[PDB]
Design an enzyme around this catalytic site. Structure first.
Site, PDB file in Angstrom:
ATOM      1  N   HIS A  47       0.849  -1.205   0.047  1.00 50.99           N
ATOM      2  CA  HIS A  47       0.100  -0.099   0.066  1.00 50.99           C
ATOM      3  C   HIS A  47       0.864   1.414  -0.046  1.00 50.99           C
ATOM      4  CE1 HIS A  47       0.000  -0.302   4.468  1.00 50.99           C
ATOM      5  NE2 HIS A  47       0.160   0.802   4.394  1.00 50.99           N
ATOM      6  N   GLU A  85       0.815  -8.370   0.796  1.00 46.76           N
ATOM      7  CA  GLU A  85       1.139  -7.002   1.302  1.00 46.76           C
ATOM      8  C   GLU A  85       2.638  -6.705   1.300  1.00 46.76           C
ATOM      9  OE1 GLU A  85      -1.487  -5.097   0.827  1.00 46.76           O
ATOM     10  OE2 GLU A  85      -0.271  -3.223   1.736  1.00 46.76           O
ATOM     11  N   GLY A  99       1.007   5.642  11.145  1.00 45.43           N
ATOM     12  CA  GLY A  99       2.442   5.960  11.449  1.00 45.43           C
ATOM     13  C   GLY A  99       3.592   4.741  11.491  1.00 45.43           C
ATOM     14  N   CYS A 152       3.058   1.880   9.879  1.00 42.70           N
ATOM     15  CA  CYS A 152       3.000   0.784   8.722  1.00 42.70           C
ATOM     16  C   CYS A 152       4.567   0.684   8.333  1.00 42.70           C
ATOM     17  CB  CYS A 152       2.345   1.192   7.756  1.00 42.70           C
ATOM     18  SG  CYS A 152       0.568   0.758   8.158  1.00 42.70           S
TER      19      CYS A 152
END
Length: 182
Positions: free
Chosen positions: A41, A72, A146, A148
Protein backbone atom coordinates in the site's frame (compact mmCIF):
# COMPACT_ATOMS: atom_id res chain seq x y z
CA UNK A 1 15.39 -2.78 28.49
CA UNK A 2 15.93 -6.55 27.83
CA UNK A 3 17.28 -8.91 25.08
CA UNK A 4 14.08 -8.48 22.99
CA UNK A 5 14.71 -4.71 22.73
CA UNK A 6 18.46 -5.43 22.25
CA UNK A 7 17.83 -7.56 19.11
CA UNK A 8 15.20 -5.05 17.83
CA UNK A 9 17.64 -2.09 18.33
CA UNK A 10 20.43 -3.95 16.44
CA UNK A 11 18.07 -4.44 13.43
CA UNK A 12 16.79 -0.83 13.51
CA UNK A 13 20.28 0.76 13.76
CA UNK A 14 21.80 -1.05 10.71
CA UNK A 15 18.92 -2.43 8.58
CA UNK A 16 16.26 0.36 8.37
CA UNK A 17 15.86 3.51 6.30
CA UNK A 18 13.06 6.09 6.10
CA UNK A 19 11.19 5.50 2.79
CA UNK A 20 8.93 8.31 1.44
CA UNK A 21 6.42 7.70 -1.41
CA UNK A 22 3.37 9.82 -2.50
CA UNK A 23 1.40 7.77 0.15
CA UNK A 24 3.66 8.94 3.09
CA UNK A 25 6.74 8.06 5.19
CA UNK A 26 7.34 4.34 6.04
CA UNK A 27 9.84 2.30 8.08
CA UNK A 28 11.64 0.24 5.37
CA UNK A 29 13.63 -2.92 6.29
CA UNK A 30 16.86 -3.53 4.27
CA UNK A 31 17.44 -7.33 3.94
CA UNK A 32 20.68 -7.75 1.84
CA UNK A 33 22.65 -5.93 -0.93
CA UNK A 34 20.30 -3.11 -2.18
CA UNK A 35 17.10 -5.14 -1.52
CA UNK A 36 14.49 -3.86 0.98
CA UNK A 37 10.79 -4.47 1.82
CA UNK A 38 7.82 -2.09 2.34
CA UNK A 39 4.02 -2.60 2.61
CA UNK A 40 2.48 -2.84 -0.90
CA UNK A 41 0.00 0.00 0.00
CA UNK A 42 3.06 2.40 -0.03
CA UNK A 43 2.58 2.27 -3.88
CA UNK A 44 6.29 2.34 -4.78
CA UNK A 45 6.97 4.03 -8.18
CA UNK A 46 10.05 4.66 -10.39
CA UNK A 47 11.54 7.13 -7.82
CA UNK A 48 11.44 6.91 -3.98
CA UNK A 49 13.06 9.08 -1.22
CA UNK A 50 15.45 7.09 1.09
CA UNK A 51 16.50 9.17 4.17
CA UNK A 52 15.42 12.25 2.06
CA UNK A 53 17.74 11.28 -0.91
CA UNK A 54 16.04 11.00 -4.36
CA UNK A 55 16.61 7.30 -5.33
CA UNK A 56 15.80 5.38 -8.55
CA UNK A 57 13.87 2.10 -8.01
CA UNK A 58 15.71 -0.55 -10.12
CA UNK A 59 12.94 -3.19 -9.57
CA UNK A 60 9.79 -3.55 -7.44
CA UNK A 61 7.58 -6.67 -6.96
CA UNK A 62 4.26 -6.86 -5.05
CA UNK A 63 4.30 -10.44 -3.72
CA UNK A 64 1.27 -12.76 -4.00
CA UNK A 65 0.96 -16.41 -2.86
CA UNK A 66 0.37 -19.31 -5.29
CA UNK A 67 -3.45 -18.89 -4.71
CA UNK A 68 -2.82 -15.43 -6.41
CA UNK A 69 -3.75 -13.79 -3.04
CA UNK A 70 -2.11 -10.48 -1.91
CA UNK A 71 0.71 -10.87 0.70
CA UNK A 72 1.04 -7.01 1.20
CA UNK A 73 4.92 -7.24 0.87
CA UNK A 74 6.66 -5.27 -1.92
CA UNK A 75 10.36 -6.18 -2.50
CA UNK A 76 12.30 -3.16 -3.77
CA UNK A 77 15.80 -2.98 -5.27
CA UNK A 78 17.26 0.55 -4.70
CA UNK A 79 19.84 2.40 -6.83
CA UNK A 80 21.75 3.09 -3.56
CA UNK A 81 25.59 3.45 -3.29
CA UNK A 82 25.72 1.22 -0.16
CA UNK A 83 24.68 -2.40 0.71
CA UNK A 84 22.64 -3.47 3.76
CA UNK A 85 24.10 -5.88 6.28
CA UNK A 86 22.82 -9.32 5.14
CA UNK A 87 20.11 -10.39 7.73
CA UNK A 88 18.56 -13.26 5.71
CA UNK A 89 19.78 -15.84 8.32
CA UNK A 90 17.38 -14.13 10.86
CA UNK A 91 14.28 -14.83 8.66
CA UNK A 92 12.02 -17.79 9.55
CA UNK A 93 11.69 -20.60 6.98
CA UNK A 94 8.02 -21.50 7.81
CA UNK A 95 4.70 -19.88 8.91
CA UNK A 96 4.61 -19.93 12.76
CA UNK A 97 3.27 -18.40 16.00
CA UNK A 98 5.70 -16.50 18.31
CA UNK A 99 6.01 -15.31 21.92
CA UNK A 100 7.29 -11.95 23.16
CA UNK A 101 7.60 -9.88 19.93
CA UNK A 102 8.71 -6.20 19.59
CA UNK A 103 7.37 -3.84 16.91
CA UNK A 104 10.04 -1.18 16.06
CA UNK A 105 9.38 2.05 14.04
CA UNK A 106 11.68 4.79 12.82
CA UNK A 107 10.15 7.81 11.01
CA UNK A 108 10.16 11.67 11.28
CA UNK A 109 6.88 11.26 13.30
CA UNK A 110 8.01 8.28 15.50
CA UNK A 111 11.86 8.19 15.95
CA UNK A 112 13.42 5.29 17.93
CA UNK A 113 10.00 3.78 18.84
CA UNK A 114 9.92 0.22 20.31
CA UNK A 115 6.59 -1.45 21.33
CA UNK A 116 6.47 -4.77 23.24
CA UNK A 117 3.40 -6.37 21.53
CA UNK A 118 3.58 -9.80 23.29
CA UNK A 119 2.18 -13.01 21.77
CA UNK A 120 1.93 -13.19 17.93
CA UNK A 121 -0.77 -15.47 16.35
CA UNK A 122 -0.47 -17.03 12.85
CA UNK A 123 -3.85 -15.44 11.92
CA UNK A 124 -3.73 -16.37 8.18
CA UNK A 125 -6.55 -14.76 6.19
CA UNK A 126 -7.42 -11.06 6.76
CA UNK A 127 -9.62 -8.71 4.74
CA UNK A 128 -7.09 -5.80 4.89
CA UNK A 129 -8.65 -2.49 3.76
CA UNK A 130 -11.04 -4.57 1.56
CA UNK A 131 -8.18 -6.69 0.01
CA UNK A 132 -8.11 -10.48 0.81
CA UNK A 133 -4.60 -11.01 2.28
CA UNK A 134 -2.76 -14.21 3.40
CA UNK A 135 0.10 -15.00 5.86
CA UNK A 136 -1.04 -12.34 8.42
CA UNK A 137 0.43 -12.26 11.95
CA UNK A 138 -1.76 -10.73 14.70
CA UNK A 139 -0.82 -9.10 18.03
CA UNK A 140 -3.05 -7.49 20.71
CA UNK A 141 -1.72 -3.90 20.62
CA UNK A 142 -3.64 -0.76 19.48
CA UNK A 143 -1.23 0.21 16.67
CA UNK A 144 -1.80 3.57 14.86
CA UNK A 145 -1.26 5.49 11.60
CA UNK A 146 2.54 5.92 11.23
CA UNK A 147 3.59 2.36 12.28
CA UNK A 148 3.20 0.74 8.80
CA UNK A 149 6.46 -0.90 7.70
CA UNK A 150 7.45 -1.26 11.37
CA UNK A 151 9.65 -4.33 11.93
CA UNK A 152 8.34 -7.24 14.04
CA UNK A 153 11.13 -9.19 15.80
CA UNK A 154 11.65 -11.81 18.47
CA UNK A 155 15.02 -12.58 20.08
CA UNK A 156 16.93 -14.04 17.12
CA UNK A 157 14.25 -13.60 14.37
CA UNK A 158 12.88 -10.90 12.02
CA UNK A 159 9.33 -12.26 11.47
CA UNK A 160 7.23 -9.54 9.73
CA UNK A 161 6.42 -5.92 8.80
CA UNK A 162 3.40 -4.07 10.25
CA UNK A 163 0.66 -3.52 7.57
CA UNK A 164 -2.53 -2.49 9.45
CA UNK A 165 -4.75 -2.53 12.51
CA UNK A 166 -8.39 -2.32 13.70
CA UNK A 167 -7.81 -0.06 16.80
CA UNK A 168 -7.45 -3.07 19.24
CA UNK A 169 -5.19 -5.45 17.22
CA UNK A 170 -2.24 -4.91 14.85
CA UNK A 171 -1.41 -7.02 11.77
CA UNK A 172 1.92 -7.83 10.12
CA UNK A 173 2.80 -9.56 6.80
CA UNK A 174 5.14 -12.55 7.37
CA UNK A 175 8.74 -12.42 6.15
CA UNK A 176 9.98 -15.86 4.99
CA UNK A 177 13.59 -16.76 3.99
CA UNK A 178 12.26 -18.11 0.61
CA UNK A 179 11.22 -14.52 -0.44
CA UNK A 180 14.94 -13.43 -0.62
CA UNK A 181 16.80 -16.39 -2.21
CA UNK A 182 19.17 -15.13 -5.02
Amino acid sequence: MGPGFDFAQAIMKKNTVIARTEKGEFTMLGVYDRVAVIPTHASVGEIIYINDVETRVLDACALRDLTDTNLEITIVKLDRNQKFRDIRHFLPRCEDDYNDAVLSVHTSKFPNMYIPVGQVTNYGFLNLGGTPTHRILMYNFPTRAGQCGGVVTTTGKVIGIHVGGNGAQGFAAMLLHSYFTD
